[PDB]
């Protein structure tokens, strides 16, 4: 069957290169498309087939009215911040689980964490520290996930695909 799953996230988390890692096996490298698409995968799971529809959204406030107009009929939502960004991290209780809950009440969240080959970046940990900021570590990850109500709490990067099918199959596994 058809699995319709949205993805909501600050601007710049990743979101855009989460879905096409995944659905194209390569991390595009100057090449990010700019059109807000929705993707597919055929893939296999526990036995059955699953077409599972992937729909990219713009993260920015200006879009704040126009957003979810892609929610309904939505049967999971991918929560996403990237795990060098703690503004991104933040505004998942800040804005984006208020605006997924008010929207659709019961629909399963699953937390998403990006960019993990950068929690270890000296360049980027030393900038970070600048603005006495930290990357944030799995149990903080963790926790947020258990605030919000999450299905799972999973991280993953989109350069390396590290994690990054576990993140689908656990969406898929969510519904
Ligand atoms: N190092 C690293 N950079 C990433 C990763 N995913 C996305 N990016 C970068 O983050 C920027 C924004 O990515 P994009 O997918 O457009 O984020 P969106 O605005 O949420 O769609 C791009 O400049 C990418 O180079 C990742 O896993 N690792
Ligand atoms: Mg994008």
């Given at each position: 069957q058809?699995?319709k799953?949205?993805?909501?996230?600050?601007?710049?988390?990743?979101?855009?290169?989460?879905?096409?890692?995944?659905?194209?096996?390569?991390?595009?490298?100057?090449?990010?498309?700019?059109?807000?698409?929705?993707?597919?995968?055929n893939?296999?799971?526990?036995?059955?087939?699953?077409?599972?529809?992937?729909?990219?959204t713009?993260?920015?406030?200006?879009?704040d009215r126009?957003?979810?107009?892609?929610?309904?009929?939505?049967?999971?939502?991918?929560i996403?911040?990237?795990?060098?960004?703690?503004?991104?991290?933040?505004?998942?209780?800040?804005?984006?689980?208020?605006?997924?809950?008010?929207?659709?009440?019961?629909?399963?969240?699953?937390?998403?964490?990006?960019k993990?080959?950068?929690?270890?970046?000296?360049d980027?940990?030393e900038?970070?520290?600048?603005?006495?900021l930290?990357?944030?570590?799995?149990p903080?990850?963790?926790?947020?996930?258990?605030?919000?109500?999450?299905?799972?709490?999973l991280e993953?990067?989109?350069?390396?695909?590290?994690?990054?099918?576990?993140?689908?199959?656990?969406?898929?596994?969510?519904?």
């Open positions: 058809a699995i799953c949205v993805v909501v996230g600050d601007g710049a988390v990743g979101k855009t290169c989460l879905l096409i890692s995944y659905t194209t096996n390569a991390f595009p490298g100057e090449y990010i498309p700019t059109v807000f698409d929705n993707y597919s995968a893939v296999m799971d526990d036995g059955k087939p699953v077409n599972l529809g992937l729909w990219d713009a993260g920015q406030e200006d879009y126009l957003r979810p107009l892609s929610y309904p009929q939505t049967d999971v939502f991918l996403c911040f990237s795990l060098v960004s703690p503004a991104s991290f933040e505004n998942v209780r800040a804005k984006w689980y208020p605006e997924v809950r008010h929207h659709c009440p019961n629909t399963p969240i699953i937390l998403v964490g990006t993990l080959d950068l929690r270890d970046d000296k980027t940990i900038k970070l520290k600048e603005k006495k930290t990357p944030i570590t799995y903080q990850g963790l926790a947020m996930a258990k605030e919000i109500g999450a299905v799972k709490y993953c990067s989109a350069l390396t695909q590290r994690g990054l099918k576990t993140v689908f199959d656990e969406a898929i596994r969510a519904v």
